[PDB]
Amino acid sequence: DDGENLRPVVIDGSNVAMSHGNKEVFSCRGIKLAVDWFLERGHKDITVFVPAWRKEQSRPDALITDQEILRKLEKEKILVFTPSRRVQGRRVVCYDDRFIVKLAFESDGIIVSNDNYRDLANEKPEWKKFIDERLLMYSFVNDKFMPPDDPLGRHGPSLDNFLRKKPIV
Structure with missing residues (x-):
């Protein structure tokens, strides 16, 4: 009853804040916009990491x-x-x-x-595989948070199924 078919979402807060901030300002609104995009879809399990x-x-x-x-x-x-x-x-x-x-x-x-966390990927193969299969890239168009509908490319899942535990066909 509360998004149990949805994958936990973990957000690189600094990446997102810098991206919304045009790479020169840490723009916290960017984090809010990304977070809100997942909330609007029914995600309840969302974590954003930011250094203290x-x-x-x-x-x-x-x-x-x-x-x-x-x-x-x-x-x-x-x-x-x-x-x-x-x-x-x-x-x-x-x-x-x-x-x-x-x-x-x-x-x-x-x-x-x-x-893409290549240093970490090169440290542990299970993490490399995971990052390969579970990274959600995105673009900002001003305040519009726009993840791709084809997050792993043409041969990957839809964005809708990418964010689910069990896909819908």
Whole structure:
């Protein structure tokens, strides 16, 4: 009764925020737009990973817009901050790519990102296979989040079936 035939969705928050932000600004609205696109379809299991330091105030070398969105998505049990802290004045950021891939793999889900995570794929063959079969790339056209209807190409599933556990034929 609550989207149990839908795959868990794991979103690369930084990838999406930078993409909506035209690669120069961390645009939190982009994360909201991606999230909302899945909610509108009945997805209940959605996780967005973002490094903790993105909570810090906007600065010239790390511009960010609509930052309050992050706390709101966290309050909705959708966004999860991954670890970061300063050590000897240097920001040390745990690799969130690893959180993204591990969570999607272990929950048998889908990854929303334009990043192909080749370093991680080259680390473990089961992850390479998984990323090959479960990556959902996308385009933004202004505020319009547009995933492809043919996410794995001409010989792959429809987008509708790609997001289901059991496909509909």
